[PDB]
Design a protein around this ligand. Structure first.
Ligand SMILES: NCCCN(CCn1cnc2c(=O)[nH]c(N)nc21)CCP(=O)(O)O
Ligand SMILES: NCCCN(CCn1cnc2c(=O)[nH]c(N)nc21)CCP(=O)(O)O
Ligand SMILES: NCCCN(CCn1cnc2c(=O)[nH]c(N)nc21)CCP(=O)(O)O
Ligand SMILES: NCCCN(CCn1cnc2c(=O)[nH]c(N)nc21)CCP(=O)(O)O
Ligand SMILES: [Mg+2]
Ligand SMILES: [Mg+2]
Ligand SMILES: [Mg+2]
Ligand SMILES: [Mg+2]
Lengths: 200, 201, 202, 196
């Protein structure tokens, strides 16, 4: 339904000085695009949407490592918060994929929620949705923190979107650039003095 | 030095549907203006700034009720987080004051005083308060305000710590109110036309 | 529900097991109630309150100074419920201390669901007075939420409607509870060391 | 520091004193370790880690699945220290499932939910020693007192618990009770319903 929080092309983002930033990343980042707390507030709402739509059956929460781990944890924490303060409640099991994970035979007949960090071309998720559906789940839904407006898009749209962003390489909140920037709490844009430095 | 997070005049804010909003305010709000989480992030840095400038002597944190209570609580929580996770720290003491003055209290003498306010608009409230505080000779007076409005009506006061500098729009939430309502709202938001009419006094 | 009961011989926790402000390092003896334990109890307390007072407009009344942390945290959890359910109720806030100095005219309490938030009940005198006073303005309901309740011989016998913890007859500090204005800037509820009790004596 | 010690006669907490998920209302006996208590212990655990390993680049290795919640929180506190200190030391994240999932010349922080016999941690240690790093330390949320123990004692311990079977906070019982804030003790009805 919703395209998520839409971030425009001309969005300047925030100065790093305005926030508390992991200072081993001072000169490598351009601006802060999505502050940690903004992600949290958005994730809280997403959690309520997920429960409204899939909270009528047992849910299997599928975390796509590594970039999705932070989103996955916070999303589940907000779901768990709903489940212990409402009369409506569904049990959840958790799984982790990259390669690994449990036998996807456990997905049969269950409500599967795939949790991803970002959709670019959409190829990764199409491949994943292809492989999951061959085990006939009761329901497959996909929640992605980010969706990128890009000419290379297939045209796939996930079921839950946190943020729709421009075609710029974002890092932070578990999103990496060659395994760097994962320990950053905010989603920020990597600079050239950060790209060339951490390249390859 | 820092004017805080500058919110542009053409800032659209956020559609309500994207966030979790209290049901009884569903039709009373127009947009989410400053999301609760953004306030926390900015406040976290603000706590570090305060500790850099005032972390030398015993401080008295003065809360300007009612609107400042949320910001007061969170800012103190962030400062306390620093105090218990760092080598050197500074002991704090808390006082409360409401202005027409209804609160107390002369205890500010010789102490580092941190006044915590929700929003500076014309500057009169703070000017008055600062005169009343300087009446009793504190070692230092500092003001942290969550919001500072850009308005021609401004006398020209600028606090030492600012979270967000905003346009001349009437905001509510995060303890800020409209005729005592909307204090029970985490986000800073803009009132709808129906909302203004419903809670009009 | 008397809340979480703490026995008279509860040793508490060694300070070395938790993160405490170093400027209180030699001023405290044991951690009595960890801050996180307080939050969890407070989460359940918020649900109970809405279950009982969610019917009509709520006026939350904070008893300064000691109750500000509990008040802010209790109301945060209540707000979390209000924006995640289909049914929510408006809530206005007020601040008093500790006669009633400061605060709005108590006539505004007329007809509303009044919820009084206090840090600690000892003799019960402070609360019984305030209750009798508030009842004069004929509100639909008056309920008292208190973080702590002491088991003391001096007790008149008042029992609040919502209790976080029932504690022994020791003097505790932290979570906005003070010893001569000190220790309010402490996250955990703790007991004072004799060295600290002597340092901040009045 | 042997961590927080929970005695054998620990009655735990009555479920009615806390907020608990509906679907586990009868599957639980007592709340054993409140979520908030876990956070407070973890916060102090983070400063212990930074005291010991915070001079060099750390690689935090998460042990799936049970350790994921403790791993996330412990990292958040370390990251919080890291962006409030003056000497911000970088850290990378790795994941391993025990061997389904899965450094040389780096500092490794292994993060685990619970030490029981030590068989899991023993294997992982010998499986990490092969890659030859600089330093390896182990952080475990729980260390269970048991006669079936090899006698391994990790470098960082949150809580020392009696020989009871606890669930919650990503610790499971046949993959259930992971969606639970507090560490709790299973009810006998719960053992029967979710048996495999
Ligand atoms: N082969 C891939 C790893 C992940 N890809 C995402 C890589 N990626 C694509 N864009 C970004 C980005 O802005 N930041 C980060 N950290 N990663 C990015 C999949 C995106 P899709 O095009 O298959 O839908
Ligand atoms: N006499 C009163 C205190 C409140 N005023 C703030 C009133 N105020 C001024 N602007 C706003 C607003 O946008 N929202 C809310 N809730 N209140 C607002 C003080 C601002 P200043 O003009 O003395 O510097
Ligand atoms: N508003 C006033 C006085 C404070 N009293 C509480 C003082 N007090 C009573 N016990 C304690 C304690 O253990 N710690 C702290 N900080 N304060 C304590 C009120 C309790 P009561 O009138 O119902 O007997
Ligand atoms: N990798 C997995 C699990 C095996 N053990 C965990 C099994 N285990 C041992 N005790 C418990 C318990 O109390 N709760 C839960 N959920 N699991 C428990 C690890 C401890 P060890 O016996 O290898 O030294
Ligand atoms: Mg991915
Ligand atoms: Mg004001
Ligand atoms: Mg009191
Ligand atoms: Mg394990």
């Amino acid at each position: 339904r919703s395209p998520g929080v839409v971030i425009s092309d001309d969005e300047p983002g925030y100065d790093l000085d305005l926030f508390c930033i992991p200072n081993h990343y001072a000169e490598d980042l351009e601006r802060v695009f999505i502050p940690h707390g903004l992600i949290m507030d958005r994730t809280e709402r997403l959690a309520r949407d997920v429960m409204k739509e899939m909270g009528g059956h047992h849910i299997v929460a599928l975390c796509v490592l590594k970039g999705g781990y932070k989103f996955f944890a916070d999303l589940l924490d907000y779901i768990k918060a709903l489940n212990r303060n409402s009369d409506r409640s569904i049990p959840m099991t958790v799984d982790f994929i990259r390669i690994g994970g449990d036998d996807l035979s456990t997905l049969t007949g269950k409500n599967v929620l795939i949790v991803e960090d970002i959709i670019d071309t959409g190829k990764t998720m199409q491949t994943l949705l292809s492989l999951v559906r061959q085990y006939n789940p009761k329901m497959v839904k996909v929640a992605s923190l980010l969706v990128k407006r890009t000419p290379r898009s297939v045209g796939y749209k996930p079921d839950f979107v946190g943020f729709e962003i421009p075609d710029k390489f974002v890092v932070g909140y578990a999103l990496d650039y060659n395994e760097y920037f994962r320990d950053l709490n905010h989603v920020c844009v990597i600079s050239e003095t950060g790209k060339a430095k951490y390249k390859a």
